[PDB]
Design a protein around this ligand. Structure first.
Ligand SMILES: *[C@@H]1O[C@H](CO)[C@@H](O)[C@H](O)[C@H]1NC(C)=O
Ligand SMILES: *[C@@H]1O[C@H](CO)[C@@H](O)[C@H](O)[C@H]1NC(C)=O
Ligand SMILES: *[C@@H]1O[C@H](CO)[C@@H](O)[C@H](O)[C@H]1NC(C)=O
Ligand SMILES: *[C@@H]1O[C@H](CO)[C@@H](O)[C@H](O)[C@H]1NC(C)=O
Length: 609
């Protein structure tokens, strides 16, 4: 019974989702709509973005200059949704009018500005989802910039495939969304060459994901392989490089057991957790890129189910790039980036020191490479295709959530070789079997993960430990969230277990589970009302009081001293009725501190007659 929000319309489908880290406001980008919802997915405001009359042939767009073309009522696909944290704004870009963007207030989604007066304010007319990504970069003191990667719809001269645009703090800035750098010969953008479009029909580059880490930004792309096959790549730029000389692009993927997964589907940047940090030999607070790959390099449009979850430490990505740079600056081989260069170009040997933070020169760039960056494969399936990924760290454990094509959400505990991570739970989110989309986001305290299909957004609890009804089940579940709350007789998070910090109140390994011993273990029916001496192993304080329940029969107050409890057998009018020569029962202790029955052990009655 998860909180959920449905699309208002079978055709106004959901595209993107983001959650404000501080307010917990949920923003959903959808066709013709941007929604602001509460934590439990109740609408507080909905901004309408379409439909509107339009035509892709109107360039510049209708909103800028008159157009003679026949117009058609057109749906506005949300292509970009990013929170501009320092400025309390939401960036929302659609497919209408050659892809202008809006800046919206976070509180009421009211429009701040909609840049439309320059040609670079038109991001792209592509109206398919999952082909564009952006990353905002702004340090304290800096005005701000926005890196955008996008498919260009074969309009290579209208729209850069990747570029940097100004994103000033002042919404009214006369420079809003201009190119960071524009010169006759040098600008802060990459254009797809006509040559490449000529070589490959409907060639385009799809931007699956993007993130900032350290001094760089990273974009993850899929595109047709220039002489079908696709290549998934990591693209890196220095954060401060208006000339784009730092451009480096390397293929990536992963393998396991003769199977190659080289077709990128989804990705998410997070911390490693202790196991992965060890495996990668990095520090706990260093970044790791988690990714979903489909089998092979073919069939981009119709992937098989065979897919994998893979992890790439940012450190290894940077290292392999630095070494590529050093090899190239030593004069070895060529730049190897045919799609962008249009020919083989030799690496230039030059007396230039390359450090971790090398930001390029006008030689040896843009830089490519044929050797893939290999990730650590964590999990594979051949059954239900993996479609999404999010991850965080709980108590030093990496918990990776992976959505599927049939609306399942897998919960995977990560560790390195041998053969980790491990799926400890799978949950059905969408009963109609709809694919889970790429965008997932956590609530403010990582209590929930918000997950979306085309027609639904659902708030999914990160854990449901209480589904485990014994200490044994609880602590053998594999779920890093779950421990056994001793006195409340329940499986929960440490933080959900009152006085968990007190001795033996919270069990974190199957070993700490309480056991009960009775002395003696059995009595004769003719021996009613006898004093039994009980011992509770691994007990917390019981001095608050203990009652003794002999099954459904009686319940008496017990005598407490440390972890020992004295209780009196039931009287003659309560001694059970033997079938057999013996009648079994369950002697249970009740905590007066909590009111809950929390342990029991078998107790026997007999009749030697
Ligand atoms: C969700 O939040 C709203 C606040 O507007 C509240 O009225 C509603 O009861 C909540 N829904 C739940 C948790 O059932
Ligand atoms: C999206 O744009 C394409 C242009 O190639 C068009 O053919 C298609 O009908 C559009 N789909 C909509 C209206 O969402
Ligand atoms: C792991 O890192 C440490 C320093 O951080 C280094 O000494 C060691 O060589 C590395 N482990 C390997 C590669 O065996
Ligand atoms: C014991 O009592 C329980 C409910 O307290 C009842 O369901 C059960 O039938 C009883 N067992 C007997 C009478 O043996």
């Amino acid at each position: 019974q998860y909180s959920t929000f449905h699309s208002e319309n079978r055709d106004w489908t959901f595209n993107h989702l983001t959650v404000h880290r501080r307010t917990g406001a949920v923003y959903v980008g959808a066709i013709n709509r941007v929604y602001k919802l509460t934590g439990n997915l109740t609408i507080q405001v909905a901004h309408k973005t379409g439909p509107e009359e339009d035509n892709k042939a109107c360039y510049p767009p209708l909103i800028v200059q008159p157009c003679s073309e026949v117009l058609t009522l057109t749906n506005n696909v949300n292509k970009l949704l990013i929170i501009d944290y320092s400025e309390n704004r939401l960036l929302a870009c659609g497919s209408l009018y050659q892809g202008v963007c809006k800046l919206l207030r976070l509180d009421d989604l009211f429009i701040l500005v909609e840049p439309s007066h320059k040609k670079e304010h038109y991001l792209s007319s592509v109206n398919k989802t999952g082909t564009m990504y952006g990353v905002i970069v702004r340090s304290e003191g800096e005005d701000g910039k926005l890196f955008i990667g996008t498919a260009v719809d074969g309009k290579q001269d209208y729209f850069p495939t990747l570029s940097s645009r100004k994103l000033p703090r002042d919404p009214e800035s006369s420079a809003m969304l201009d190119y960071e750098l524009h010169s006759d010969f040098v600008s802060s953008l990459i254009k797809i060459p006509s040559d490449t479009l000529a070589l490959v029909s409907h060639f385009d580059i799809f931007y699956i994901y993007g993130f900032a880490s350290g001094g760089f930004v990273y974009f993850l792309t899929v595109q047709p392989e220039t002489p079908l096959f696709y290549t998934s790549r990591i693209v890196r730029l220095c954060k401060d490089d208006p000339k784009f000389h730092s451009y480096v692009s390397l293929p990536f993927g992963c393998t396991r057991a003769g199977v190659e997964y080289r077709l990128l589907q989804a990705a998410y940047l997070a911390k490693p957790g202790e196991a992965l940090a060890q495996a990668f030999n990095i520090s706990s607070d260093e970044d790791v890129l988690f990714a979903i790959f489909s089998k092979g390099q073919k069939q981009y449009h119709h992937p098989p189910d065979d897919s994998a979850l893979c992890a790439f430490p940012i450190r290894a990505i940077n290292l392999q790039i630095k070494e590529r740079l050093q090899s190239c600056y030593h004069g070895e081989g060529n730049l190897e980036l045919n799609w962008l260069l249009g020919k083989d170009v030799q690496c230039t040997k030059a007396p230039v020191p390359i450090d971790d933070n090398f930001c390029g020169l006008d030689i040896n760039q843009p830089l490519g490479g044929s050797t893939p960056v290999e990730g650590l494969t964590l999990y594979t399936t051949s059954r239900d295709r993996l479609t999404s990924v999010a991850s965080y760290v709980y108590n030093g454990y990496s918990v990776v959530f992976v959505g599927t094509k049939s609306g399942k959400l897998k919960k995977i505990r990560a560790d390195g070789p041998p053969h980790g991570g491990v799926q400890y739970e799978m949950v059905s989110v969408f009963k109609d079997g709809s694919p889970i989309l790429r965008d997932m986001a956590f609530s403010i305290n990582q209590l929930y993960l918000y997950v979306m299909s085309e027609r639904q957004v659902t708030r999914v609890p990160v854990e449901s430990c209480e589904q485990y009804t014994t200490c044994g089940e609880c602590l053998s579940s594999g779920d890093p969230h779950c421990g056994w709350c001793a006195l409340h007789n329940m499986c929960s998070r440490r933080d959900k277990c009152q006085r968990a910090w007190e001795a033996n109140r919270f069990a974190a390994s199957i070993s700490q589970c309480m056991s009960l011993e009775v002395h003696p273990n059995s009595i004769s029916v003719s021996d009613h009302s006898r004093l039994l001496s009980l011992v509770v192993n691994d007990a917390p304080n019981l001095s608050e009081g203990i009652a003794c329940a002999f099954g459904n029969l009686t319940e008496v107050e017990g005598q407490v001293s440390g972890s020992q409890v004295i209780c009196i057998s039931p009287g003659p009018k309560d001694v059970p009725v033997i079938p057999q020569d013996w009648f079994g029962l369950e002697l249970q202790l009740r905590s007066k501190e909590t009111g809950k029955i929390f342990v029991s052990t078998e107790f026997k009655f007999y009749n030697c007659s």
